[PDB]
């Protein structure tokens, strides 16, 4: 199977790309594996594969850190993400987001059932399971426990059986057979948990699949619509069905070539201290647990030589910024286009710590609408901040079509020179707010409400008569004949390539 | 000595390997400025144009990018550091500390010399033809040839006591005339208004190009009203600046200047000025505005004279490395004078010289028993009512875990610690900077408001203290683990 349909083939693709370090020396899953991963994320280095995790027994487990973080070569910066999606390692951010949105407008390709697969090579059951003895990583020194679940896919089905949701939500080892996880509104895993609580079910059938098909983990991180099963969406992205096998102990289905699967239940009643966790905004709060639902593990099935993927998230740049912000930005682009707004492109600039989305406006179509910045900013915020894909995003920046929204430097130039602070902003204090952001949960107002803005970084004339300025840069302030004369002279004169 | 002589500064750049000697003929119509602009956009070596097309009887060579950035992270500010007798590895803090060092010590008065290198050559009265000199065309949509982008205007108040040195742009306007930007609240405009008020038509004036590098830095710094830059510069340099008297008036110019224009600034005569590709990265084609006329009566110049040139615009040129960073230095000082607990200030490059980050001593802040809403309003009232605050539209207050000299730390604090709208105080009534496009070409008054203070201190920083740890390699892992990882890094196959 190709890299985008097999995690084991994806790992080999990273080896072929010279984008993976096989670490054969013993590495402690207590902080050492995550510290190496964290420093890889902070320097855009090669992904670390820990082949010799201290405490591994019977094939559980190796660790792959930084599965979807950035490469250091600017022409292949997003290459590890492109290898999730059957894209070349030179793929632009636009190419990656366009591919994730490609299934939005075409029929689902439904999964196919197979009788077995690699994930059934090994098993541990019932009283033989000891999660505290497995080498689950300690990801940050002040975390509330060992966060085994940072890059696996929760599988949970609605009571009526029609909707199977695949998503990423963190979970830590809680006990011999238990995890505690973050399960918050408005996420689909919480919506489904509430649908089971409402019919009185105490224990919901659940599975957690680690090292799924790379296309599946990307879709698991993307806010596709309510009621849409990710498996069919994944099939439409990948151009073929995902092969699923039935769980041993329940009626759920997991990818047949997953590395590791936990089968069990999600409680609708019981909670345990969950957290704290070093989180996508770059913070951990020592001692600050919150109650989270209990997952109970009844069976573990795994491949020979199983690999647990791990995201050591925090300050720039890891999977929380490369996947959560950018896939939110993709779905925000689709929301805006469905509303009839002239938005061509959306990205979550890394400088925004995945709380910003920049929206590129086709200014020719904006002028046909005969509106103004104040009215347009309100409309964009009403469309986006009332819908689930806008949940994590607190600042929308509207820029014209001379700005590359995929380039943090262009977005910052537009924001700081075209948006008059206060005057050119519309504040939203009645919308749902993201409580993980420290200015929300450790801030001056309600943790779950408000704190959002749309920043109009289009200049006044862009709404009426058009661009009346020229950039004071090499590209726009000098004739092409002068630019070419300089480029052809550059190295001969003694300037660098 | 490089901080006291522009010619010695150019030889210091040569010895740092930070200068390209360009001996091929280069056109001052857009080609010199295009090379400079690309140097500024890639942080490359300063270009010295030794062969300017149209050069006449020794006028002139051109030095581009005199205070732009070097690409090596360890010496990023080395070009600014050679203005100030600092090592090329000097931090931004070192440069700003040195510029503020003269705030708290006695001025070192300039000493007069009878002659100097600047008097080696001259052109006078009817022989002056500014239109035939190779003044650069700096941007293709500029309203004329911006001869003056890095020289020091010398103008004395009517009381005789206050001599101001300052950078303000000017373009060739005719055979003997420049037209310039002279706006409130800049001291060149304050002094022009003092002369108009007592009835003087033509104010004695000089413009010195290639001045002592310490002087051009102080020329770009909003030091207080009524303080002569010459004495401040002396106290920075730890010795007197040697001045010579102009031939045709009673003003004094650095004796080793490359080129001096002597003449008058009119209080009545106006001429079309601009547009000019400016510090925010914009030019508006066809948008000139009346500016005051400068009349040139005499030019004196060194043999092999060099005109310095700032090709300003998008990042990173002298307007970002000097205008915002020196405003931030003076904003730090103002805050400390008002008794606010500010230890450090910088103008992040991402802000396009419109942002200043202020680093708060949080131990001192907790001892004041205040809150963010109150403190943000108080800091804005102190800064946005004073001249050094003029160009700055956003102040970001950060705690003392944030390196305000590092744009990544500043954006991390701003995006994660300042709740949009809730944690911001907006200033609608203060003087605004009309050069910023969102002011001059925006939705409200060009000269009033559009400012904000962003409280990027978390709620607990005001009361009981920092209660998080960064989720980064340095703060989330014990020192024993960090060392084991750093000692293993290269051997395992990661990059240095
Ligand atoms: C890539 C990724 C996305 C995480 C994530 C992480 C990663 C690495 C972690 C594990 C490292 C930190 C935790 N994460 C959480 C999270 N969403 C959530 O509700 N709880 C979280 O704990 N997300 C986002 C979540 O996956 C997206 O919001 C999906 O759109 C949710 O799927 P749904 O739309 O089907 O609800
Ligand atoms: C380094 C530098 C600073 C410029 C400047 C430029 C540069 C290269 C240019 C030439 C490239 C673009 C023009 N500049 C102007 C300017 N201030 C001003 O009032 N008009 C301007 O035209 N400044 C800033 C000015 O020098 C500072 O605000 C000083 O504090 C003014 O001195 P003063 O405090 O004595 O008034
Ligand atoms: K999902
Ligand atoms: K605007
Ligand atoms: K000055
Ligand atoms: K705050
Ligand atoms: Mn879903
Ligand atoms: Mn002054």
Numbering used by the authors:
A (entry chain A): 14 to 510
B (entry chain B): 15 to 510
Sentences from the paper on this structure:
The prenylated flavin (prFMN)-dependent ferulic acid decarboxylases (Fdc) catalyse reversible non-oxidative (de)carboxylation of a range of acrylic acids with extended conjugation. The final step in the pathway consists of the decarboxylation of 3-methylcrotonic acid, catalysed by an evolved ferulic acid decarboxylase (Fdc) enzyme. Herein, we report on discovery and optimization through directed evolution of Fdc decarboxylation activity with 3-methylcrotonic acid to produce isobutene. Recently, a reversible 1,3-dipolar cycloaddition mechanism was conclusively shown to underpin catalysis in Aspergillus niger Fdc (AnFdc).
Initial in vivo screening tested 15 UbiD homologues co-expressed with UbiX (E. coli K-12) in E. coli for conversion of 3-methylcrotonic acid into isobutene as detected by gas chromatography. TaFdc exhibited over twice the isobutene production compared to other homologues and a directed evolution approach was taken to generate a variant of TaFdc with superior isobutene production activity and selectivity for 3-methylcrotonic acid over cinnamic acid (schematically presented in Supplementary Fig. 1). In order to understand how TaFdcV mutations aid in isobutene production, crystal structures of TaFdc and TaFdcV were solved at a resolution of 1.74 and 1.89 Å, respectively. An overlay of the wild-type and the variant crystal structures shows that the key residues F447, Q200 and the catalytic network of E287–R183–E292 are unaffected by the mutations. The E292 residue side chain occupies ‘up’ and ‘down’ conformations, while weak electron density suggests a high degree of mobility for the L449 side chain. The mobile E292 and L449 gate access to the active site while the Q448W mutation in TaFdcV narrows the binding pocket. TaFdc showed decarboxylation activity with cinnamic and sorbic acid, with rates kobs = 7.2 ± 0.3 and 3.2 ± 0.3 s−1, respectively (reported for a batch with a 380:280 nm ratio of 0.067). In contrast, the wild-type TaFdc required prolonged incubation with 50 mM 3-methylcrotonic acid to achieve full spectral conversion, suggesting a substantially higher KD and/or adduct formation rate for the wild-type enzyme. The T405M and Q448W mutations are likely to be responsible for the increased selectivity for 3-methylcrotonic acid in TaFdcV by enhancing the substrate/active site shape complementarity, blocking access to larger substrates. While comparison of TaFdc and TaFdcV crystal structures reveals the basis for increased selectivity in the evolved enzyme, it is not immediately clear why 3-methylcrotonic acid can yield isobutene from Int3.
